[PDB]
Amino acid sequence: MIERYVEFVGEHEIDAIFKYAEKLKDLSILHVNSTAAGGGVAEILHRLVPLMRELGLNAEWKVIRGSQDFFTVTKSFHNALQTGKGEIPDEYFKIYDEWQEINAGEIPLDYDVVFIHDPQPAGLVKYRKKGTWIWRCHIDISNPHPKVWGFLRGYISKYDGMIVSIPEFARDDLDIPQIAIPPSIDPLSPKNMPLPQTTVDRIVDKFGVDRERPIILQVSRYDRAKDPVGVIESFRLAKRHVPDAQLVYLGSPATDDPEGEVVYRETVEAARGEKDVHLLMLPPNSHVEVNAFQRAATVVMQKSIKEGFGLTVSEALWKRKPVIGGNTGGIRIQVINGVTGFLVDSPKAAAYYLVYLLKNKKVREEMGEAGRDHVRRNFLITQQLRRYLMAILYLTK
Ligand SMILES: O=c1ccn([C@@H]2O[C@H](COP(=O)(O)OP(=O)(O)O[C@H]3O[C@H](CO)[C@@H](O)[C@H](O)[C@H]3O)[C@@H](O)[C@H]2O)c(=O)[nH]1
């Protein structure tokens, strides 16, 4: 399995992974998250944990269960931490704590290393036994809702360490080690592997999208932080100068997002009037369909208001597509302004750069190549895996 990555990263990184893994062969490692299918965390763990096993680590991945009430609370925490907005009643904290207790009763926590992914299972640390506990934060916690952060910091401050996606998310109100590890893409997954043109054509055709006209694509949940409405507004402004252009918004449900269905309707509303707008909702693990659309796209957008990293940016850059990205969080380490695409602060700036890229085929192609090179150097699964092993070795001494 690992030997296959030599092509992309060279012998020296593969040697490094083997020597780190050799030191860790005797350790039991648990990963805990809140979703089995959908979202970036499940995307990482579905590839990362099997690779840990290939290297001879005793790695397990557990998904917590919860009610709709629990996932309503966790999503409100998610939005509050990233945006600093909203009212959070004390009832939310009681619901949160009860589901930590329920899950703790059904998870064996006495692993050498426990990785807790994102806020949903952070409270499990109350029931810790032996071993090293690491909190893996996938979101923007630079400017959080003080009530939600106050509550969660009570748990995080009990961890042995913390991983954030970029240094800028490191907290000055935590004294535990805060390690920056960017997420990555697995070039060998069905999400990112080469596709034959016949498959790309067939999937784009199936969804009624014109393969002969430009495609502007955003792959994202119907979530306010992804700004599907602002993407529609970007498209409307740009279509004035590229009237043949089409917009594809490709969304899909996650287990732990109970408002994915609500935001659709204000997207559909904002879309009514335009017929080259395609609002797709695909089942979980529609890997090949996302792959195909990313390969069909002329330009890809990830115009997030808030973003921990945004795997969809690296997925597009790897397939040699330039990205127009929201000027926020981990998008800024993937989109090198004027090299791998453009960082934008408004739909107006998004539209400006959409028209520029649609009118400049040679620039698109060169930015595409620079994107793939930037992902190759920085955001492949081998790099993320090596930093995980390094983090474990450090934090277990
Ligand atoms: O219809 C869809 C929409 C998305 N995806 C995939 O789902 C993932 C989405 O990941 P990302 O764009 O990163 O978003 P989140 O689900 O919000 O992921 C969280 O965790 C990720 C990993 O750390 C970070 O990149 C994010 O910023 C963070 O919010 C990618 O693999 C997408 O291809 C699909 O397969 N189908």
Resolution (A): 1.9
**191 lies in a domain?**
no
- Binding site residue list for UDP-alpha-D-glucose: 40, 191, 221, 226, 307-311, 315
CB of 161 shorter than 6 A to ligand 1: no
Same domain, 176 and 201: no
Sign of the Cα pseudo-torsion (374, 376, 380, 382, in order): negative
The verdict on residue 146 lying in a domain is: yes
Neighbour count for residue 130 (Cβ, 10 Å): 9
d(CA 106, CA 308): 30
Rounded-to-integer distance, Cα 122 and Cα 291, Å: 32
334: in domain = yes
H runs (alpha helix) in the chain: 6-9, 11-24, 39-54, 68-83, 90-104, 146-156, 197-206, 228-239, 260-271, 287-296, 311-318, 331-334, 347-358, 361-378, 381-395
Q: How far does the centroid of ligand 1 lie from the alpha carbon of residue 214, in Å?
A: 24
Whether residue 148 is found in the same domain as residue 265: no
What's the chain's Rg over C-alpha atoms?
21
**Residue 264 domain flag:** yes
How far apart are alpha carbons 58 and 103 in whole angstroms? 21
Tell me, in angstroms, the distance from the centre of ligand 1 to residue 115's CA.
Answer: 19
Do 111 and 259 belong together in one domain?
no
In this structure, are 142 and 233 located in the same domain?
Answer: no
Write out the DSSP string of 266-288.
Answer: HHHHHHTT-SSEEEEE--TT-HH
User: Does 61 reside within a domain?
Assistant: yes
Cβ 139 under 6 angstroms from ligand 1:
yes
- The answer to whether residue 189 is domain-embedded is no
- Nearest residue (by CA) to ligand 1, atom 13, is 310
- Torsion, Cα of 174, 49, 318, 4 (10° steps): 140
Residue keyed to tokens 């096993």: 53
Distance from C-alpha of 98 to C-alpha of 81, rounded to nearest angstrom: 21
Residue 271 phi, psi dihedral angles, 5° rounding: -95, -40
| Domain that residue 385 falls in | 2-184+380-395
- How far does residue 39's CA lie from ligand 1's centre (Å)? 4
CA 109, CA 131: separation in Å to the nearest integer?
Answer: 9
For 358-377, b where at least 16 C-beta lie within 10 A, e where not — what string?
Answer: beeeeebeebbebbbebbee
Residue 228 main-chain phi, psi, to 5 deg: -60, -35
Per the CB < 8 A criterion, the answer to whether 24 and 112 are in contact is no
Say if ligand 1 is within 6 A of residue 252 CB: yes
Q: Is the CB of 311 under 6 A from ligand 1?
A: yes
Helix and strand numbers (H, E) in the chain are 15, 12
Q: 127 and 229: one domain? A: no
Same domain, 219 and 161: no
In the three-class reduction of DSSP (H, G, I as helix; E, B as strand; rest coil), residue 113 is classed as strand
40 lines ligand 1 (CB under 6 A): yes
Q: Does residue 374 share a domain with residue 354? A: yes
Q: Is residue 41 part of a domain?
A: yes
The rounded distance, in Å, linking the Cα atoms of 160 and 139 is 19
225 and 299 housed in the same domain: yes
Same domain, 137 and 70: yes
Instruction: Ligand 1, residue 282: give the atom nearest the CA.
Output: 1
> 214 with 329, same domain?
yes
Annotate 259-296 with b (16+ C-beta within 10 A) or e (fewer): bbeebbeebeebbeeeebbbbbebeebbbebbbbbbbb
What SS3 state is found at 381?
helix
- Quote the number of domains for the chain: 2
**Residue 53 maps to which CATH number?**
3.40.50.2000
Q: Indicate whether 192 belongs to any domain.
A: no
Is the minimum distance from the CB of 307 to ligand 1 under 6 angstroms?
Answer: yes
Distance CA 369, CA 350 (A): 21
Output the six-digit token pair for 369.
Answer: 């190549």
Resolved by: X-ray
In b/e form, how buried is each residue of 35-46, taking b as 16+ CB within 10 angstroms?
A: beebbbbbbbbb
